[PDB]
Symmetry: C2
């Protein structure tokens, strides 16, 4: 399951853009990059309506999947809308990730595990991934 795109080496200095469509009536969706679904250097969750989190961005990482979520960083500079096309561009160096949301904020999150190569990408939740661009 998944597609291995040989040519795409998401190393320090590359810009990975993901694009797709948010569902109508979303709860939340995330962009996840790391080594596997269990070992994520960045989980970028846009929470539309998720209990106490209403239009909040939450960023975190985990080495133990769902049971290893660490210190959350949150932003209320929420610019995405239900049912719409989105694009988020990620890049990083050994110190940090730089998150450029199209027509929205620019955020930074620590590169907590000092990664210089990230082999895995997934979108989770109420959105559909349709494009991956690497430059």
């Amino acid at each position: 399951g998944g597609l291995q795109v040989k040519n795409f080496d998401f190393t320090v200095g590359k810009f990975l853009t993901v694009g797709g469509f948010i569902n109508n009536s979303p709860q939340r969706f995330s962009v996840n990059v790391g080594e596997s679904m269990n070992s994520l250097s960045l989980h970028l969750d846009h929470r539309f309506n998720y209990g106490a989190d209403q239009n909040t961005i939450v960023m975190n990482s985990t080495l133990k999947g769902d049971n290893g979520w660490e210190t959350e960083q949150r932003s209320t500079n929420f610019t995405l809308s239900a049912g719409q096309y989105f694009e988020i561009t990620l890049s990083y160096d050994i110190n940090k990730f730089y998150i450029d949301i199209l027509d929205g904020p620019n955020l930074e999150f620590p590169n907590r595990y000092s990664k210089e190569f990230l082999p895995f990408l997934s979108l989770a939740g109420d959105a559909r991934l349709t494009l991956v661009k690497l430059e």
Copy 2:
């Protein structure tokens, strides 16, 4: 090396579009889909200037990498240019692959190994992959 895009299941009925830039002064470049670099259901080679092949499309498959190339199918309906952006959309069913080159031909090639899922994608040669879209 490569990026695993979890969400992209290139199954029968999906449309995979690859986009990128052809090098200046190219010899040839290919789009390759299959199970690995050694086991390819489709190798779609655009040969600009490759000895006797001058602006010829060659399509083939292999189960043994470079030593298992099978019966080539060729087309001279060559529409790509050096230095330019290209996009090719692939889809398939159990019988065949359908190759839609943007502003160029529509080609078909047999699905020789009766595949219904293709886990691997690579571009090879004188071009640079910049986008992968799955719909």
